[PDB]
Amino acid sequence: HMECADVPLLTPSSKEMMSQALKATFSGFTKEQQRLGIPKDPRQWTETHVRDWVMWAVNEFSLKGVDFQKFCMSGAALCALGKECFLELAPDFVGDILWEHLEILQKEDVK
Known part of the structure; x- marks a missing residue:
């Protein structure tokens, strides 16, 4: 899920770039969640x-x-x-990508 055993040092791979985008996108989510009202928990979504x-x-x-x-x-x-x-x-x-971050919301906000 997202990244499996990755130590950013001297191993340039697409897997590292994939996490990079996701990591930076997270911060841009809460900014929208507050603008629209979208909660952190995916189960309480519509x-x-x-x-x-x-x-x-x-x-x-x-x-x-x-x-x-x-x-x-x-x-x-x-x-x-x-x-x-x-x-x-x-x-x-x-x-x-969607399910990656989407699943994170579930784990982060259990139930």
């Missing part, structure tokens, strides 16, 4: 928070090909779907 986030995640990582029609549901539903289901809703590339 269609608006889901879409507003997805869209925001597309601007943070300049993603493309992701649709909000597939994510037209509340957080409780999105979480219930699981990684596989969520990955089926979003593209083969962007889907990973």
Whole structure:
């Protein structure tokens, strides 16, 4: 999930760059969560928070090909779907990023 055993020193790899973006995006999330009202816990989310986030995640990582029609549901539903289901809703590339940070919200905010 995100990064598995990585020590940034002298090992330039795409995996390190992937975490870099995610790490910097986090700070840009709370700034939006306060502007829109989106809570930290993904289970207490709704269609608006889901879409507003997805869209925001597309601007943070300049993603493309992701649709909000597939994510037209509340957080409780999105979480219930699981990684596989969520990955089926979003593209083969962007889907990973969203679920990466999305899953973090779950672990960070248990229940």
